[PDB]
Amino acid sequence: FRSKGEELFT
Amino acid sequence: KPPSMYKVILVNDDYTPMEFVIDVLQKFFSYDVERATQLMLAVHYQGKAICGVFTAEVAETKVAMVNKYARENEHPLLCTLEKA
Ligand SMILES: [Cl-]
Secondary structure (H helix, E strand, C coil), X not given: XXXXXXXXXX | CCCCEEEEEEECCCXXXXXHHHHHHHHHHCCCHHHHHXXXXXXXXXXXXXXXXXXXXXXHHHHHHHXXXXXXXXXXXXXXXXXX
């Protein structure tokens, strides 16, 4: 999948 | 004659946002954010992962709903059935 630059916290 | 059970599988793709998949997992599989995120990453890194295992009818409803929700939000996210 694609990250939107956000941090997952996981 | 016990019923056959079906695995609900999420398949990875390069265009669905991670945020979205996480949402799917909470909304349609009652995962909390933390577990959902780890599961999304299991899919992301391994290419596929089991979201749950259900009686056939339950499973096929999850799958249909997940896919419909995905298309309606214009993502290619694919959910599929596998016989356990
Ligand atoms: Cl029976």
